[PDB]
Design a protein around this ligand. Sequence first.
Ligand SMILES: CC(=O)N[C@H]1[C@H](O)[C@H](O)[C@@H](O[C@@H]2[C@H](O)[C@H](O[C@@H]3[C@H](O)[C@@H](O[C@@H]4[C@H](O)[C@@H](O[C@@H]5[C@H](O)[C@H](O[C@@H]6[C@H](O)[C@@H](O)O[C@H](C)[C@H]6NC(C)=O)O[C@H](CO)[C@H]5O)O[C@H](C)[C@H]4NC(C)=O)O[C@H](C)[C@H]3NC(C)=O)O[C@H](CO)[C@H]2O)O[C@@H]1C
Ligand SMILES: CC(=O)N[C@H]1[C@H](O)[C@H](O)[C@@H](O[C@@H]2[C@H](O)[C@H](O[C@@H]3[C@H](O)[C@@H](O[C@@H]4[C@H](O)[C@@H](O[C@@H]5[C@H](O)[C@H](O[C@@H]6[C@H](O)[C@@H](O)O[C@H](C)[C@H]6NC(C)=O)O[C@H](CO)[C@H]5O)O[C@H](C)[C@H]4NC(C)=O)O[C@H](C)[C@H]3NC(C)=O)O[C@H](CO)[C@H]2O)O[C@@H]1C
Ligand SMILES: CC(=O)N[C@H]1[C@H](O)[C@H](O)[C@@H](O[C@@H]2[C@H](O)[C@H](O[C@@H]3[C@H](O)[C@@H](O[C@@H]4[C@H](O)[C@@H](O[C@@H]5[C@H](O)[C@H](O[C@@H]6[C@H](O)[C@@H](O)O[C@H](C)[C@H]6NC(C)=O)O[C@H](CO)[C@H]5O)O[C@H](C)[C@H]4NC(C)=O)O[C@H](C)[C@H]3NC(C)=O)O[C@H](CO)[C@H]2O)O[C@@H]1C
Ligand SMILES: CC(=O)N[C@H]1[C@H](O)[C@H](O)[C@@H](O[C@@H]2[C@H](O)[C@H](O[C@@H]3[C@H](O)[C@@H](O[C@@H]4[C@H](O)[C@@H](O[C@@H]5[C@H](O)[C@H](O[C@@H]6[C@H](O)[C@@H](O)O[C@H](C)[C@H]6NC(C)=O)O[C@H](CO)[C@H]5O)O[C@H](C)[C@H]4NC(C)=O)O[C@H](C)[C@H]3NC(C)=O)O[C@H](CO)[C@H]2O)O[C@@H]1C
Ligand SMILES: CC(=O)N[C@H]1[C@H](O)[C@H](O)[C@@H](O[C@@H]2[C@H](O)[C@H](O[C@@H]3[C@H](O)[C@@H](O[C@@H]4[C@H](O)[C@@H](O[C@@H]5[C@H](O)[C@H](O[C@@H]6[C@H](O)[C@@H](O)O[C@H](C)[C@H]6NC(C)=O)O[C@H](CO)[C@H]5O)O[C@H](C)[C@H]4NC(C)=O)O[C@H](C)[C@H]3NC(C)=O)O[C@H](CO)[C@H]2O)O[C@@H]1C
Ligand SMILES: CC(=O)N[C@H]1[C@H](O)[C@H](O)[C@@H](O[C@@H]2[C@H](O)[C@H](O[C@@H]3[C@H](O)[C@@H](O[C@@H]4[C@H](O)[C@@H](O[C@@H]5[C@H](O)[C@H](O[C@@H]6[C@H](O)[C@@H](O)O[C@H](C)[C@H]6NC(C)=O)O[C@H](CO)[C@H]5O)O[C@H](C)[C@H]4NC(C)=O)O[C@H](C)[C@H]3NC(C)=O)O[C@H](CO)[C@H]2O)O[C@@H]1C
Ligand SMILES: CC(=O)N[C@H]1[C@H](O)[C@H](O)[C@@H](O[C@@H]2[C@H](O)[C@H](O[C@@H]3[C@H](O)[C@@H](O[C@@H]4[C@H](O)[C@@H](O[C@@H]5[C@H](O)[C@H](O[C@@H]6[C@H](O)[C@@H](O)O[C@H](C)[C@H]6NC(C)=O)O[C@H](CO)[C@H]5O)O[C@H](C)[C@H]4NC(C)=O)O[C@H](C)[C@H]3NC(C)=O)O[C@H](CO)[C@H]2O)O[C@@H]1C
Ligand SMILES: [Ca+2]
Ligand SMILES: [Ca+2]
Ligand SMILES: [Ca+2]
Ligand SMILES: [Ca+2]
Ligand SMILES: [Ca+2]
Ligand SMILES: [Ca+2]
Ligand SMILES: [Ca+2]
Ligand SMILES: [Ca+2]
Ligand SMILES: [Ca+2]
Ligand SMILES: [Ca+2]
Ligand SMILES: [Ca+2]
Ligand SMILES: [Ca+2]
Ligand SMILES: [Ca+2]
Ligand SMILES: [Ca+2]
Ligand SMILES: [Ca+2]
Ligand SMILES: [Ca+2]
Ligand SMILES: [Ca+2]
Ligand SMILES: [Ca+2]
Lengths: 242, 242, 242, 242, 242, 242
Amino acid sequence: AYTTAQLVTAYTNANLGKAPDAATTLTLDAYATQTQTGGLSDAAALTNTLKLVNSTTAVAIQTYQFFTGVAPSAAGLDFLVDSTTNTNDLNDAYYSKFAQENRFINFSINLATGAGAGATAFAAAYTGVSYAQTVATAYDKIIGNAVATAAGVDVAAAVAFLSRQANIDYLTAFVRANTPFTAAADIDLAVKAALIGTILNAATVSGIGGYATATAAMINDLSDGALSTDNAAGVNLFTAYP
Amino acid sequence: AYTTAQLVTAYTNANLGKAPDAATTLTLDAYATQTQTGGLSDAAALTNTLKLVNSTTAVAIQTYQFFTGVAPSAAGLDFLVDSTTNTNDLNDAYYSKFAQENRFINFSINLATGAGAGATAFAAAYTGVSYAQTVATAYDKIIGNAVATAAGVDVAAAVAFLSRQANIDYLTAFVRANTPFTAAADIDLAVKAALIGTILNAATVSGIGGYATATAAMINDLSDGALSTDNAAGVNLFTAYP
Amino acid sequence: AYTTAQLVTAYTNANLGKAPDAATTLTLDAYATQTQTGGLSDAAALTNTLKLVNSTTAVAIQTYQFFTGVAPSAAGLDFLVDSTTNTNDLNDAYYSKFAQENRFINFSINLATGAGAGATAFAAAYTGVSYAQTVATAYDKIIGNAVATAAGVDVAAAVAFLSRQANIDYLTAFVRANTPFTAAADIDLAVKAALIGTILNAATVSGIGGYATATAAMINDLSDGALSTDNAAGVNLFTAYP
Amino acid sequence: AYTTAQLVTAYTNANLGKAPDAATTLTLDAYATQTQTGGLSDAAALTNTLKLVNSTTAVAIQTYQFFTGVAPSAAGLDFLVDSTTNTNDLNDAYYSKFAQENRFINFSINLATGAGAGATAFAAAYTGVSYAQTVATAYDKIIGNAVATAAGVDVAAAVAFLSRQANIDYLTAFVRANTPFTAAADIDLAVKAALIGTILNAATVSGIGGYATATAAMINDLSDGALSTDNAAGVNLFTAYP
Amino acid sequence: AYTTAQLVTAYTNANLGKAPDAATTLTLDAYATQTQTGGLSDAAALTNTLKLVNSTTAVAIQTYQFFTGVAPSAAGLDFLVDSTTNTNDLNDAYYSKFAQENRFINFSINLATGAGAGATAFAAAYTGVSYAQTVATAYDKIIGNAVATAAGVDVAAAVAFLSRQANIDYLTAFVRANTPFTAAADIDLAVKAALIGTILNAATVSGIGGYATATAAMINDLSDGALSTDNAAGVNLFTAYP
Amino acid sequence: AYTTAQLVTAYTNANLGKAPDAATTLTLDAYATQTQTGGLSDAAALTNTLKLVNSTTAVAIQTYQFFTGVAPSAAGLDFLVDSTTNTNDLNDAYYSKFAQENRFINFSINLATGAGAGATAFAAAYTGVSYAQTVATAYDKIIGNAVATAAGVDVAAAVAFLSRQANIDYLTAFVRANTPFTAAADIDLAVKAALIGTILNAATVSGIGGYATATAAMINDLSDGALSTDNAAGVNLFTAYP
Ligand SMILES: CC(=O)N[C@H]1[C@H](O)[C@H](O)[C@@H](O[C@@H]2[C@H](O)[C@H](O[C@@H]3[C@H](O)[C@@H](O[C@@H]4[C@H](O)[C@@H](O[C@@H]5[C@H](O)[C@H](O[C@@H]6[C@H](O)[C@@H](O)O[C@H](C)[C@H]6NC(C)=O)O[C@H](CO)[C@H]5O)O[C@H](C)[C@H]4NC(C)=O)O[C@H](C)[C@H]3NC(C)=O)O[C@H](CO)[C@H]2O)O[C@@H]1C
Ligand SMILES: CC(=O)N[C@H]1[C@H](O)[C@H](O)[C@@H](O[C@@H]2[C@H](O)[C@H](O[C@@H]3[C@H](O)[C@@H](O[C@@H]4[C@H](O)[C@@H](O[C@@H]5[C@H](O)[C@H](O[C@@H]6[C@H](O)[C@@H](O)O[C@H](C)[C@H]6NC(C)=O)O[C@H](CO)[C@H]5O)O[C@H](C)[C@H]4NC(C)=O)O[C@H](C)[C@H]3NC(C)=O)O[C@H](CO)[C@H]2O)O[C@@H]1C
Ligand SMILES: CC(=O)N[C@H]1[C@H](O)[C@H](O)[C@@H](O[C@@H]2[C@H](O)[C@H](O[C@@H]3[C@H](O)[C@@H](O[C@@H]4[C@H](O)[C@@H](O[C@@H]5[C@H](O)[C@H](O[C@@H]6[C@H](O)[C@@H](O)O[C@H](C)[C@H]6NC(C)=O)O[C@H](CO)[C@H]5O)O[C@H](C)[C@H]4NC(C)=O)O[C@H](C)[C@H]3NC(C)=O)O[C@H](CO)[C@H]2O)O[C@@H]1C
Ligand SMILES: CC(=O)N[C@H]1[C@H](O)[C@H](O)[C@@H](O[C@@H]2[C@H](O)[C@H](O[C@@H]3[C@H](O)[C@@H](O[C@@H]4[C@H](O)[C@@H](O[C@@H]5[C@H](O)[C@H](O[C@@H]6[C@H](O)[C@@H](O)O[C@H](C)[C@H]6NC(C)=O)O[C@H](CO)[C@H]5O)O[C@H](C)[C@H]4NC(C)=O)O[C@H](C)[C@H]3NC(C)=O)O[C@H](CO)[C@H]2O)O[C@@H]1C
Ligand SMILES: CC(=O)N[C@H]1[C@H](O)[C@H](O)[C@@H](O[C@@H]2[C@H](O)[C@H](O[C@@H]3[C@H](O)[C@@H](O[C@@H]4[C@H](O)[C@@H](O[C@@H]5[C@H](O)[C@H](O[C@@H]6[C@H](O)[C@@H](O)O[C@H](C)[C@H]6NC(C)=O)O[C@H](CO)[C@H]5O)O[C@H](C)[C@H]4NC(C)=O)O[C@H](C)[C@H]3NC(C)=O)O[C@H](CO)[C@H]2O)O[C@@H]1C
Ligand SMILES: CC(=O)N[C@H]1[C@H](O)[C@H](O)[C@@H](O[C@@H]2[C@H](O)[C@H](O[C@@H]3[C@H](O)[C@@H](O[C@@H]4[C@H](O)[C@@H](O[C@@H]5[C@H](O)[C@H](O[C@@H]6[C@H](O)[C@@H](O)O[C@H](C)[C@H]6NC(C)=O)O[C@H](CO)[C@H]5O)O[C@H](C)[C@H]4NC(C)=O)O[C@H](C)[C@H]3NC(C)=O)O[C@H](CO)[C@H]2O)O[C@@H]1C
Ligand SMILES: CC(=O)N[C@H]1[C@H](O)[C@H](O)[C@@H](O[C@@H]2[C@H](O)[C@H](O[C@@H]3[C@H](O)[C@@H](O[C@@H]4[C@H](O)[C@@H](O[C@@H]5[C@H](O)[C@H](O[C@@H]6[C@H](O)[C@@H](O)O[C@H](C)[C@H]6NC(C)=O)O[C@H](CO)[C@H]5O)O[C@H](C)[C@H]4NC(C)=O)O[C@H](C)[C@H]3NC(C)=O)O[C@H](CO)[C@H]2O)O[C@@H]1C
Ligand SMILES: [Ca+2]
Ligand SMILES: [Ca+2]
Ligand SMILES: [Ca+2]
Ligand SMILES: [Ca+2]
Ligand SMILES: [Ca+2]
Ligand SMILES: [Ca+2]
Ligand SMILES: [Ca+2]
Ligand SMILES: [Ca+2]
Ligand SMILES: [Ca+2]
Ligand SMILES: [Ca+2]
Ligand SMILES: [Ca+2]
Ligand SMILES: [Ca+2]
Ligand SMILES: [Ca+2]
Ligand SMILES: [Ca+2]
Ligand SMILES: [Ca+2]
Ligand SMILES: [Ca+2]
Ligand SMILES: [Ca+2]
Ligand SMILES: [Ca+2]
């Protein structure tokens, strides 16, 4: 049985010191009532509670792991999500106008293009590759073909939907109108990051794939208040939480 | 085997001293015959007998528990349902023109708006929340998403039906024409109580959810004549009947 | 193996001394042949043999039990069905123009209206009750909601069919044109008896319900020639044959 | 393994000394080959061999059993089917123009009307009975309602088909144009025999019912050459072959 | 594992010294490869290898067995299929223009009409029999009604298809234009042989029936090079290979 | 768990010293990630890794085995796929314009026509055989009728599709416009090689058949770097890898 005070504290640690909104408080309150009435197990309530921090914390963990090869530390997560020194962070008015999918795309573009840490690695490996191939390889890397088929979703339809011309046209307009890029090569590279960022958003929403499971464990690890690993140079998701 | 005299006495205690109507007497008489003919078990007949007091007793128990956080005592139930000092109570001519759903809405509006005990708590928590969010959170709090899916009903369709624009338009007309409220904020808060009151009526009619099960046990506890707990400050449903 | 002589004697005792008709004799003869050829068990043949006395004996037993609260005795059954002192009885030319359903309605009207034994009790309990409620309560009392659903028949459709406006219009015309009643209250009470009488006919035709099972046992008890209980003041079906 | 010589001898005894036709010889020869090739068991071949004598021997056995109450003896069967003293018998040119169904009707009319042995018994029992009732009772007596439903055939459809107005119109034309009867009562009685005769033909063709099973055993008993019972006054099928 | 040299030698013995054609050699070569790759068992390859000799050897065995009552010997098979003294045999240019079905019909006509060994027996038994009866009896004799139903094919449809007016019109044209017969009786008898010959072709193509199984064993017996029985007066298929 | 360095080395040995392309590197990288995240077993990743060398290595192994009767050695594979002395090999700019199916056809034409090693054997066996027969025999030889049916694919539809007139018209145009052949016999022989080459491409794409399984084992054997057999005169696939 979870009290509403316990759930909001777990959410606060997962959200890194940010108090829940009034609407989210009612959702957390509903979860607490279900546990007391025998309608929801203790483990299920916590997982649902930690599922509300997807747009604010899971975006920071997953984008760094794919691009920079390592997830940010507790101090790095604190700076990115909710910090006093960072005026523009994930849960402030600067990002308040974005959705979950747009937030994933923004970090993907920033990391792979310009002054991002993984920008040089992204350009070397993702050059000379078509849009369809990038989607196909990223989908297998993030979610996986075997795992997705076992879960029930159709891989062939999902890959085609993500690589449709409508998605490409919208993303290239998003890159050109927003990013300070105008060359064909620079725009082409940035669209690839946007395509990958969409896949990352799809994986965390559905919860299927190695990336989605790994970031869930890290959020659960951070839920109690202190990260168990908390490595200074970053936490490798795949080896910290096998 | 239940005699018709036993069933009406159980109903009278559940209805708090009110004699059954002539139509309800035939329904109770039919239940007694089925038990004697081996067509209905003793436990099933009593549960069906206590299912006829939904509009007169279960409304008082459930509305107080959700809003004030505690169910009324035996003396409090007596005053609300059938008392000599209370000229206008649930089973008199004042409420004789209402249906089951309208009765649930009336207590919800009275408790959450004006001089209700839980009015101050309701305003603090349910401010800045949209209509769709209030329905979604209340449905999970009262009935529950996991329990409803297991029972067979579709949660997604049920929530959309309860939050349709037709329901909102009818409820806001009900609030404005009946309640002494004219400000946008006051009307908006009252409609939220009406939306929650509809959910409470849905839960007790279908019998799915923690609230429906809890109020059934309290009515069964009151059926014999004396409430087992009968706390002076109120009976907490979720801890008295786990 | 049942001989045709044995079957007609069992039918005669069930019909209370009335010899079977020529058409019914062939039906009884067919049952005897099936037992000798190994196509029908001994118990099944007797039950089918006793199923042909529904319109002449089961009508007397069931109507008295529902209205007067007790089934007629062996002497009472003899007077009602086939007696020398009673010029107008069930199996004579006076009732030869009626069907099974009409026979059930006639006793229901006679008992509940006028000089019937149960007329005073029927008026006290069945006053202020709508037609739909009377059908719903009688159907549960006679057949039962749980038993009917288990058997496979749809209760919701059956109740609506029995309470349709076409049935009410036919029955009120039957009451007004036949019974010596013209007041609204007297006609309304008589139609309720007709509605109940139709339900009794439905129960005995289909064989589902406590009433149908109980009257079958009494007919089987009377089949051998002498009733086992044969109480002077009447036989209570539900306690004599649990 | 049955040789073609053995099969024709079994058929000859079943047909009471009549040699098989050239077409029937090929059918018997085909049965013999199947047994030698392992495609048909010995018991199945004999039953199929004895199924070809339906129109010549099973008609004599079944009609007498239903009407006269006893099957003909071996000498009686010999006179009826194939005898030197009887110029007009079942397997001669006199009956060579009839089919299986017409042969059954002819004996039914002869036995129940005119100088038949069972004519007086048939008139006493089958007077005052409608056509539909006669078909319904005869079908239960010969085939049976329970047995037919278990086999898979629909009793309700079969009875209605046998009692259709087209069947009655054809049969009454058959009776009037052929039998020397013109009165309404005499024609009505003869049509009842024709209706029963059709049922007997249906039972032996399909092989369902006590009559069909009983006459099959008697033919099998006669197959070896000598009847085991061979009672002088007739063989009662239901007690000789339980 | 079968080598391509072994398969062609088995086919040569089955074909009685005739070397396989170039097209058939590839088919035999494909069977050998499948056994070496673990895609086909040794027994299955030999049965498929012996299934290619249907039009040249199984025609001689089956037609003699049905008509003359005995299959030809090894010397008789050698003369009929592939012999130096016989200029016109089954696998030469004389029969190179015929198909499998036409080859079966040719032997049936030759044996049952003219100077055939079984011509006198065929005329005595198959006189006075209609076309439909001949097809029905031959189908039961060759394939069998019980065996065909167990295999899954519909006997009623198959018999009607083989006895359709289109088949009769084609066969009677085949008989009249080819055979030196012009009388009605002679043509009628020859068409019956053609109808039976078609059934024999159907049985060996599908592989269902006692005849098809028996001739397969004899071909398998001849496959090694020397027939095990090799009776001088002929081999009776049904007793040599039970 | 496979590292991306291990997968590319396995692919390099399978591709015989050729470094993977940038697009293929991402595919190999995705396989490595899945193994580390527990979404793909070690054996499955290697098989998928070796499935990307179908167009460059499996074409050399399979075409030689079918036509020349033996697969090329490690030195022979090195010369054909990736060698310094061979300016025009499978993975250079000379073959960079072809697809997988066209590559299979090219070797089939070269080997069976002109100066190919198996040209003389192909002409001797595949002369006087129709197009439909060649497809039917090759399909059974390469994939097999029994194996294909067990896998689920329809053999009858597949053979008809491969032998359709549209396929023949395209292939004969391919032969005439490309190969230096103009005679009817030479073109006819070359089209047969093209038809077989298409079947080989179909077998390796679907992975069904003895040829597909055998060439997979040889590629797996070559994956570690050194071939286990490495016979100087060639490796017989069916006996080296049973
Ligand atoms: C392992 C670990 O724990 N490491 C930590 C360290 O130990 C240490 O504690 C600390 O570090 C930080 C961190 O590494 C930081 O990384 C940044 C960061 O990931 C990210 O930052 C953003 C960037 O500085 C910048 O913004 C603009 C802006 O997004 C703009 O986009 C427009 C615009 O918003 C408006 O017009 O709306 C449009 C729709 C929008 N367009 C799009 C496409 O979205 O776009 C431009 C061009 O893309 C972009 O430059 O400002 C943001 C506010 C900022 N975000 C946050 C949350 O702060 O990406 C950087 C590339 C990345 N830098 C490097 C280097 O990798 O870097 C600082 C140093 O600069 C470091 O101290 O934290 C570690 C995690
Ligand atoms: C724990 C426990 O056991 N406690 C008990 C105590 O120990 C003690 O024994 C005792 O207490 C009572 C009780 O707490 C009472 O609580 C009241 C009560 O819940 C409720 O009361 C109603 C209210 O006083 C009032 O009415 C009007 C009216 O409903 C009107 O609505 C119109 C109108 O009917 C007509 O026009 O038709 C329209 C369709 C209708 N509109 C709508 C929208 O329905 O609407 C106005 C505005 O909403 C409303 O004020 O009169 C009712 C007759 C009355 N109902 C009953 C059953 O009595 O709500 C009050 C807000 C609530 N008060 C407080 C405070 O919470 O309060 C009294 C003291 O006043 C107390 O003694 O019982 C405890 C249970
Ligand atoms: C426990 C036990 O065993 N008790 C027995 C006693 O110990 C004792 O042995 C003995 O008793 C009898 C019995 O109690 C009797 O009961 C009667 C009886 O149940 C019933 O009787 C009928 C009634 O007297 C009457 O008839 C008319 C008539 O039905 C008429 O209807 C018209 C008409 O037929 C024509 O126009 O066609 C129309 C279509 C039709 N209309 C309708 C609607 O059908 O309608 C009027 C008004 O309804 C009606 O009065 O005459 C009938 C012939 C008679 N039936 C039989 C079978 O006899 O109902 C009585 C109300 C009931 N009486 C009492 C009192 O309850 O009563 C006598 C004394 O009168 C008693 O000796 O048997 C016990 C079973
Ligand atoms: C256990 C359960 O749940 N059962 C239910 C079923 O599962 C099902 O859901 C529904 O099914 C029904 C049910 O089986 C039913 O049966 C009918 C019914 O019993 C009755 O129905 C009445 C009838 O159609 C009709 O009657 C007239 C009338 O009897 C008339 O007689 C006159 C008249 O009384 C007066 O003038 O006096 C005269 C002397 C008299 N003449 C006589 C007696 O000769 O005679 C005519 C024929 O000439 C007759 O049509 O109309 C009534 C309104 C109707 N009543 C109701 C309540 O509907 O009798 C039918 C013979 C009977 N049918 C069959 C078949 O048995 O059947 C329907 C058929 O669709 C079925 O759907 O409900 C169950 C409760
Ligand atoms: C127990 C036992 O074993 N008993 C045996 C005895 O011990 C003893 O061995 C011995 O007995 C016989 C037997 O009992 C016989 O029984 C006969 C017999 O069952 C049957 O006989 C037929 C009857 O005599 C008669 O014919 C005409 C004819 O059918 C005609 O019909 C016309 C006509 O054919 C033409 O116009 O075509 C029309 C389409 C056709 N119409 C129809 C409707 O079909 O119709 C008339 C009127 O119906 C009819 O009389 O002649 C037949 C040739 C004959 N059939 C045979 C097979 O012989 O029915 C008799 C009524 C019955 N008699 C008695 C008595 O029951 O009787 C003799 C004595 O007469 C007896 O020796 O065998 C015992 C079995
Ligand atoms: C048990 C055993 O092993 N016995 C063997 C012996 O021990 C001994 O070793 C030896 O015997 C042979 C064998 O018994 C032979 O039997 C023959 C044989 O079965 C068969 O022979 C055919 C017949 O002689 C004949 O031909 C014509 C021709 O078919 C013609 O048809 C035309 C024509 O082809 C053209 O116009 O095209 C048309 C489409 C075609 N029409 C049709 C309808 O097809 O039709 C006429 C009339 O039907 C026909 O006579 O010539 C054939 C070439 C020949 N076939 C072969 C394969 O040789 O049928 C004979 C009736 C049969 N004879 C007897 C007798 O039964 O007989 C010789 C002696 O003549 C004997 O030495 O082999 C035993 C098996
Ligand atoms: C068991 C083992 O390991 N053996 C090895 C040896 O031990 C030894 O190590 C070594 O041997 C080689 C090898 O045996 C070689 O075999 C060749 C080879 O299989 C193949 O070679 C091709 C051929 O020489 C040739 O080309 C043209 C060309 O393809 C042309 O096609 C046109 C053209 O490309 C353009 O116009 O586009 C068109 C679309 C196209 N048309 C079509 C239809 O595709 O077509 C003509 C006519 O078909 C053709 O001649 O040149 C190619 C570049 C070459 N391919 C490669 C990969 O090198 O087929 C030869 C017939 C075969 N030779 C013999 C002999 O069998 O032979 C050399 C000696 O010449 C030997 O040293 O390797 C062993 C495996
Ligand atoms: Ca913080
Ligand atoms: Ca901040
Ligand atoms: Ca932790
Ligand atoms: Ca009270
Ligand atoms: Ca009151
Ligand atoms: Ca209690
Ligand atoms: Ca009597
Ligand atoms: Ca009387
Ligand atoms: Ca008794
Ligand atoms: Ca005889
Ligand atoms: Ca005779
Ligand atoms: Ca016997
Ligand atoms: Ca030879
Ligand atoms: Ca020859
Ligand atoms: Ca052998
Ligand atoms: Ca190399
Ligand atoms: Ca090269
Ligand atoms: Ca190796």
